[PDB]
């Protein structure tokens, strides 16, 4: 109810990382600027936690970053950095903490995951995944974290790993039908949706959804356009695919998937053009 979409950083039309922060209101369909981040960051991830926006790692065009900055939803300020420089990492929240896994530090793709406690402003290293992954999102469903696809430095991946906080271990679940890197991922009505990405040859408009109860993937109606390094978030029971790269140009549009009609609609074409930005939801 009155949630909005937030999009930060990424790769802009001047072919460099940017600092632009925008919010989109699906109801009014209006965009607006927020205060710019301090360091320009592409390949960056964002989460929201208790009316706080976090912008995590990324890449300034020179080095991969472990630094993190925060905005109270306003002025941006620096908090404790991660232990690993990470571009194109997955990021999510679970029980008042941030989890970040995988990524690329300019030399190695990571298996590692670490966790942020806002109560003490510290990042703690957790268990490694089985496969090193850049370009893989994180998604939480019912207390458990899923890391989907990505790229290990040699192959685009269709494998999916599951982290159980009760065991502290990663295990495997049934893989996606398509190898995907740079896809957007979100939970919608207890299904994990994976939109777009890159399969090694083509930039994808295809979409798959994972039924967690039955451990099975099924094909979903494709998006209006291919989108790689695209963000995905759910608002009011609908799935949004934000900006990205269609294989030719940067995109400024957001399209919205509605299960009632089982189709994708463009809901705006007026954002800044960008890809590998970070996205999250704000409760106003």
């Amino acid at each position: 109810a009155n949630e909005v979409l937030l999009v930060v950083g990424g790769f802009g039309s001047q072919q460099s990382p940017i600092d632009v922060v925008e919010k989109y209101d699906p109801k009014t369909q209006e965009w607006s600027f927020l205060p710019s981040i301090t360091r320009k960051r592409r390949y960056v991830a964002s989460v929201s936690l208790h009316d706080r926006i976090y912008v995590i790692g990324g890449y300034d065009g020179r080095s991969r970053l472990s630094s993190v900055e925060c905005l109270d939803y306003g002025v941006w300020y620096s908090v404790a950095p991660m232990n690993v420089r990470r571009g194109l990492a997955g990021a999510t929240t679970l029980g008042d903490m941030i989890y970040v896994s995988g990524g690329f530090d300019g030399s190695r793709r990571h298996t590692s995951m670490e966790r942020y406690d806002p109560n003490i402003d510290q990042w703690s290293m957790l268990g490694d995944m089985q496969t090193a992954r850049e370009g893989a999102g994180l998604v939480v469903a019912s207390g458990v974290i899923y890391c989907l696809g990505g790229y290990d430095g040699l192959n685009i991946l269709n494998s999916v790993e599951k982290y159980d906080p009760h065991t502290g271990h990663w295990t495997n679940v049934t893989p996606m039908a398509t190898k995907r890197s740079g896809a957007g991922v979100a939970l919608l009505n207890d299904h994990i949706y994976v939109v777009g990405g890159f399969d090694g040859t083509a930039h994808l408009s295809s979409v798959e959804a994972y039924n967690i109860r039955t451990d099975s993937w099924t094909t979903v109606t494709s998006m209006t356009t291919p989108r790689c390094y695209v963000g995905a978030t759910v608002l009011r029971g609908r799935l949004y695919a934000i900006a990205g790269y269609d294989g030719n140009s940067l995109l400024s549009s957001i399209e919205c998937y509605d299960p009632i009609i089982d189709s994708w609609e463009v809901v705006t074409s007026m954002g800044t053009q960008r890809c590998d930005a970070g996205v999250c939801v704000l409760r106003e």
């Binding site: 790769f11 790229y151 890197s181 740079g182 990405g197 890159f198 090694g200 790689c228 790269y245 890809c275």
Partner: peptide, 4 residues
């Protein structure tokens, strides 16, 4: 890979 697949990016700009």
């Amino acid at each position: 890979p697949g990016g700009p």
